[model samples]
Target: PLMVKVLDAVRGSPAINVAIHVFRKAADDTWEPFASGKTSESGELHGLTTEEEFVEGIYKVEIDTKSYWKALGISPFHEHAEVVFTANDSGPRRYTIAALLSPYSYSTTAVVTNP
Candidate 1:
């Protein structure tokens, strides 16, 4: 299944809602919305897209940390955190766009957890 998992939500802090968006590139070089969701209390957005399905090409996942920061009355180095990934026919089926978030900054990694 394709997932946009937001983990490591502000350590030792109160949980808040997080916005997640998924987009696939169209022929016009524009990002077309594919799916969107919010993180659970643990800050994970599992099965956020068409689970177990994908079109091979460039895709983008935007994680809005601004909402979470606003909820907690904190400052953010970046309001919108974005990551791009690709799915290929020869690649793994199970995909992940995992992120490590903080009040001020965030980092991410994309991986194929299952083949």
Candidate 2:
């Protein structure tokens, strides 16, 4: 399975209540969301897992940063951030896909793996 941890860089802003969507890459390289949620008081969102976990192949993850920032009554330069990666194998491994989000820019990373 894939695990995602989303964050809102605009601390103490109402944007923390913004909704987030988690998408997986389909066979055609298109994104299909399997889960969604809103950020917490700490400007964070968690536990957006896949429907039937994930199989070995490429996957894509995206976040709606524009709506998230707008929720705080501010305009965001970045509408969203998309990340693509490959899961070559599967097991009881922990995977972390994180987004470093701000109003103007965003970044993501595939920072974890297991044997």
Candidate 3:
């Protein structure tokens, strides 16, 4: 399975209820919707995908940072944040895409593993 973790740098806490959208690149170089969810109270999102459904391809994990900041009454610079990478080319693996969000900046790290 795949998961996501989002932390709010400004609030010093979990970025709860932040929207997330995941897309997989197709053969024709177009992005296709794969999964969507909101971060939990723990700032974590799980079960975005399973091994069988998560095939080899490029993927985009889009985080709605703008909305999240707006909800806290702050005007953020970026509209959204996205992380793109390749997956499952060599073998099936799991991913924990962790992101730290701020009003003016963001950072991300990937934790990939085999089952």
Candidate 4:
């Protein structure tokens, strides 16, 4: 299972309505779309992918920072916040990926736990 949380660092609030795109790396090195959704009122998103489809491989989370910032009447420096990593190499695990976003910068972190 995979979960995502996005926060507005400047405002110290949940980054609501932020668009998030998920993808898995294919054999040919192309990104294959897995799931896509926008953050909820709590700045969190769930059910991006089922455990069955979350196979062992590299995954990517592309956050649309610019659109979110633009909606807030601010110009963001980064076009998108991309979080990419390999998953399930050792064993089945659940992930909680969070992003703290500001106009000029962003920080991404992940909490991994056994399934």
Better of 1 and 3 by lDDT: 3
Query: Arrange candidates by TM-score, highest first: which order?
Result: 4, 3, 1, 2
Q: Global lDDT of each model? A: 0.74, 0.66, 0.93, 0.94
The prediction achieving the highest TM-score against the true structure is: 4
Worst 10 residues of 4 by lDDT: 46-55
How far out, in Å, is residue 33 in model 2?
3.5
TM-score of each: 0.83, 0.70, 0.97, 0.98
Question: Which candidate has the top score in lDDT?
Answer: 4
Clashing pairs in 4: none
Tens-digit per-residue lDDT, 24-101, candidate 2: 677787777667777676555666664346556566666677887686787988868777776655444556777777
User: lDDT for model 1, on a 0 to 1 scale?
Assistant: 0.74
In candidate 4, residue 67 scores what lDDT?
Answer: 99
- Report model 1's TM-score to 2 decimal places: 0.83
* Model 2 misplaced regions, further than 4 Å: 12-15, 42-46, 50-52, 88-92
